[model samples]
Target: RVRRSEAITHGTPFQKAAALVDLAEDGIGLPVEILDQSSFGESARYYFIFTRLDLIWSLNYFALLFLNFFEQPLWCEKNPKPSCKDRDYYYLGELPYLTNAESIIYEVITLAILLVHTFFPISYEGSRIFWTSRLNLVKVACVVILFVDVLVDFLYLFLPFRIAPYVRVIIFILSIRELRDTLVLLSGMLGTYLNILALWMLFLLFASWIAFVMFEDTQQGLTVFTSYGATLYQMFILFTTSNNPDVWIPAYKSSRWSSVFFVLYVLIGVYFVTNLILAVVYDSFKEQLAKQVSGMDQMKRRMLEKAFGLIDSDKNGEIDKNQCIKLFEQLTNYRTLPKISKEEFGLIFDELDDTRDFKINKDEFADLCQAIALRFQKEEVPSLFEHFPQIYHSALSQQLRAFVRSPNFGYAISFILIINFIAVVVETTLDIEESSAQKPWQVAEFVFGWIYVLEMALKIYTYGFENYWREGANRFDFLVTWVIVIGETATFITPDENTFFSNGEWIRYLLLARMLRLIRLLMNVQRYRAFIATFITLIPSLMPYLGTIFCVLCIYCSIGVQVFGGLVNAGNKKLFETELAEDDYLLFNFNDYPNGMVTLFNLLVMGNWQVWMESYKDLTGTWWSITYFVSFYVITILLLLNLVVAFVLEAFFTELDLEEEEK
Candidate 1:
């Protein structure tokens, strides 16, 4: 304890804590020998905690690897179509012999280590022999297996990892004793049930990450990580915040779907999982507190003795305001003991608190002051002034706001989203027959991937990296952007298993990145220099009412769809189908114009009559489908469109209101 305290005293705060530890030990009259043991034990426990935390996280990485193993067969099915688009079983069954053998060896070892650590024994007193126990041997076995698994998974990133279940089974059988011991120990605590639940949730979240990883490309109509396991791996990284750039591609940098997925994963990992951990900690802490409080209550009459031990002034068995101030001053000020503020000084020696007669006994003013001062204090947020000076006039600061002055990040991201949507539509349209293997179909996939990467870079540059990581919105942006980049990069690197894919696919993929240049607009929203925040806040509050207006737009769209669906033209069904259907007269050319309202009514009132008919006919694939599609269209075109106009009007009024308020 002395050596540790000496080692920690290089800093003022550490020296104070060291002094406090010494004072506390003396005050409590704790035996120096027990104190030594206690300090060492705590240090040892800290080591275990640190090691376990790392191992658990690493174990999680390997466990998740298995979840991504099924990607290949998913998209690479019967009618390949340039990229994997068919429904075939991919994954373990197709692995090479050597890779398979290695993977099997790895899985068995990792699983054993996990089980052993779970069941390892320590003294019931919570001291010593934790990792040294028989249970720990099992855990070690699991660790070995996990290491093997990690190695195999590493291979997947560049080559391929495979394994036979039979080999892994043999490894698992070898670790039975460690497994049994771990299982037995785990069943003991009331917390055992929760631990079990957490273990499963961890695995489930892992699986989901991979699933999301595999199928993310499919979101853009690309079949890159189309396998169930692969998608789960993607989702695992999504939740874990460990998603790498070497994985799934994004169809675009700013995908709405990707944004939503990122938000949901954050809710699960940071919010839900963190809350679970805190809950468990709180429960255990409360239990310990209960025992401590109960023991203290039995010795309440000894308060004076305890007080006397803590205070060092006169031996008259009383402490005063000056002494309390000295103690507090010593704690807060490291440069030198700080002086008490006027307010604090008065608090220590108030008139009422200072009174003490024969009947009143010793003055309690010092304790009273301590209680009062502590009670009124509130947690304070760090002042903006403190950090503002560091960044306000800096060059990097200028770069952050560069987008604000120019076309903007919001606009950029918006462009990317729009272009990606266009790209998807184009790909879907061209491959409508779903049999375009002869064509360079994967070209579209390759193009969108790179654009996704560029979009992410813009966002990172716009938002300060630290601030962005801390924020949910920023994190979501990062994930979506990175996923696109990663997915594209992966596609770019992935060897064409066959001559099926062409370098043209790479060119197309690279060119598609042009769509990401749209991310420039994203700058507009996050710059914080605009009226966007206030304007956006108002929209949500008014949505219920504004949403109804969108419904009206839907009616308009529906009316147009019905009117245009009928009536064909005679001259050329393809060119003037409407007029022919209506009156058996075809005006194939503008010189062969149809007479009367056929030209006036249909052309002017109905809105691109032919296109509307095609879209309208497909609206009712299901009643719910039409309902959903219309709702979204109305929300976007009518509600959001008008809302922005209204927003501008509100801003004008807001300035007027503010001016009035100032007056």
Candidate 2:
């Protein structure tokens, strides 16, 4: 039940209930029947259980003390005493009063109890004094527990330790619990069921988690975890790995231990942790569906109220769907109700099918209804163009859509290089690179001439000068032009200082100025400009289909080069240019753009055939190279492409449907 907007003038309703109960008790007229003995029994059981947890958490410290004697035997047998070169024996950061185990267990137990109170089955009669019920005692306990959990979890990230088992246990247990909550409940359920909210929270959570996990543990030990509060700030980081030296050195204490720990961690992270995430998501989806289904009766009631309100346009008592549609059309300034095309209306009706009898009924529409009637009765849907009118180039928009398909954009970009190369050559040869014999005023005037002329020309060409001249960039461009002119004026007009080469520095600076001018050429390479556009449009298009394609290609390349190329080359060389000879081996230069293109082309355009013949001729080595090359090429190029295409199609259908709806 939600709280009403009006503030209560009198005491809360629960206070009223208490007054009535007190009066009844004083009169001794009300018969009391304690229905259940579970509370007393549960409280007694919980008392002992919590006491055990407290003691177990406390006793964990004794293990650290007991293990102290074994430290010499286990670790420092050869050198028991601290050494300046080795042990250093420095004082590590001060830990909190409680160990990590104490912090975690205390908090978890507290939250568990408080959670029980909130979950307790209760009768709701619109009486409230902020949870003042028979179960309030349990609720208070749970609240306290949750409070402790937060305090301790925060402390674990900051508090320093000296091989303290209790502290480690506390930290480990709380972290495990948090991870479980994250995987099974928070991220898993929330993200899957309430996608939009989940996505926003998920981004925040992971961003914080990454910052926390990676940095918190690193910021520990002698110099790092100096303050408990500061250490706790690490809960923000999402993905933490020991590969990070700063975190690894402090937490692991030894490089050998670090390696082992990371290997095990990677396994746990990828296998168990990932599965836990999936499990939570699945559970959340089921829960959301169940809740929605159970509320069908309530939904029907709400639907009736909504329908009546919709139909009563003139505040006339009641009406029907047609009347509601008509009222909505008039209110929205539409010429007629259901003005949408017949095809669109039919699609909406089909989607609204609840009974599956090949027809739409009032009950079906009402049963799972949303804001359907409002949308259905509207005129033509809005386009993206109408929403965002800032677009200036048709060619740019078209190219952006197709850029991700293949190499077409790259081919188109060759024009930019040709244009720039010509400009750079011509400018370098011109006296624009020279700086001398011009007066200060003359130099300033000349530079200003270029700026004013260039800016005006751009505006005139891009937008008719009238419209372009009114744009904000028109003013900023004028400012930048003057700044360039003023700066260049000093270099060009100032008298020569150097005897060896008069105005050498000025000439050098001018040449640099010419180079800076070439930056404008970067904007001309439309392929690079369209990269952002390509990604927005095409990643969703190609990603689903191309993921498997890429993975298979990577695998094929890896295996093919390993087996076939191994005969020619003894070991892996990342770049072909880095190798002593090109024929010595086949290189896999993954980072190089040209190399990636070449590799993909080889598979797609039958380069493996030539490779096979060469291997066969050299099969004094048994031509195993030819066999592997051919196999990899076939699998990676053909089969992988099909899988990628399938993925793309599935994604395309979903996107297309959404686009259609928006239209």
Candidate with top TM-score is 1
Tens-place lDDT digits, model 2, residues 1-663? 111111111233332222222222223221111111212223323333343354444344334223212222112112334431231122111212344466455545544543443343222211353256543444355345446546665664632212232332333223222222222322333334345334434543554444345444343333443444333322211122312344335556533554464455446554654445445444554464355445544544443433333334454453444443433333233212335553664566558664333422344444323344333432322232323444534677445534533565435433543443444444445446574443453434344346444544443444444344454445545555555455555545666674533432233233233334345445457444333333345654454334334434444433333333212222323222332234432432211222333455554655323433343335324534445554554344333343334334444555556555666
What is candidate 1's lDDT per residue for 170-217, written digit by digit as tens?
233333333332223223323633573467466666656545553454
User: Which portions of model 2 miss their true places by more than 4 Å?
Assistant: 1-539, 561-566, 570-601, 607-609, 616-620, 640-663
Model 1: residue 371 alpha-carbon error in angstroms: 16
> Model 1 scores what on Cα lDDT?
0.42
List residue ranges in candidate 1 displaced over 4 A. 1-92, 95-393, 399-419, 433-451, 458-480, 490-663
